[PDB]
């Protein structure tokens, strides 16, 4: 079924993790007024690129869902699988992990370059 942009707001993080390509979709394309238009037109690509920037300095240029090699520090959440994917919503979930998102991102940054520096060595010997 097709709900709409942001339609799975109050949906469980499992059901909301279905409709990802819809929120990712309506995110780019869509003299007084003339200037408003221009610093809104750049703001949208700046804000968009800053996310692709992250996905790219991780390994997740795929993208949508992307697994990684940094293990989940229980201190961050510690909740069980069911009670976040089949229970909580992303609006809710965001505020819990909010305290360490940038610290989590740092774990990701080092881990990706570590992968690359390694994979060169594999293709080097083989």
Place of tokens 């990712």: 24
State the minimum distance, in angstroms, from the CB of residue 99 to another protein.
13
The span from the CA of 63 to the CA of 104, in Å, is: 18
Cβ burial of 89 (10 Å; 0-12, 13-18, 19+) is middle
Contact 32, 25 (CB under 8 A): no
Among 4-12, 70-78, 83-91, 112-120, which window interacts with its own copies (CB under 8 A)?
112-120
Tokens of 3: 């709900």
**Token code pair at residue 40:** 């809104």
Q: How far is the CB of 110 from another protein (least distance, A)?
A: 13
Least Cβ distance, residue 104 to another protein (angstroms): 6
Query: Which range in 5-13, 70-78, 82-90, 108-116 contacts its own copies by CB under 8 A?
Result: 108-116
Cβ proximity of 6 and 23 under 8 Å: yes
Q: Which residue has the tokens 């992303």?
A: 90
Stretch that binds its own copies, among 3-11, 46-54, 71-79, 91-99 (CB under 8 A): 46-54
45 binds its own copies (CB under 8 A): yes
- Name the site residues for its own copies (rule: CB under 8 A): 17-18, 20-21, 24-25, 27-29, 38-39, 41-42, 45-46, 48-50, 53, 56-57, 59, 61-65, 67, 109-110, 112-113, 116-117, 119-120, 123
């Amino acid at each position: 079924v097709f709900l709409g942009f942001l339609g799975a707001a109050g949906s469980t993080m499992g059901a909301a993790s279905m409709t990802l390509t819809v929120q990712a979709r309506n995110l780019l394309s869509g003299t007084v007024w003339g200037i408003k238009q221009l610093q809104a037109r750049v703001l949208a690509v700046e804000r968009y690129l800053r996310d692709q920037q992250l996905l790219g300095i991780w390994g997740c240029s795929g993208k949508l869902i992307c697994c990684t090699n940094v293990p989940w520090n229980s201190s961050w959440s510690n909740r069980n699988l069911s009670e976040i994917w089949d229970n909580m919503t992303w609006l809710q979930w965001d505020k819990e992990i909010s305290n360490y998102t940038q610290i989590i991102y740092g774990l990701l940054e080092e881990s990706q370059n570590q992968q690359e520096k390694n994979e060169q060595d594999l293709l080097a010997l083989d």
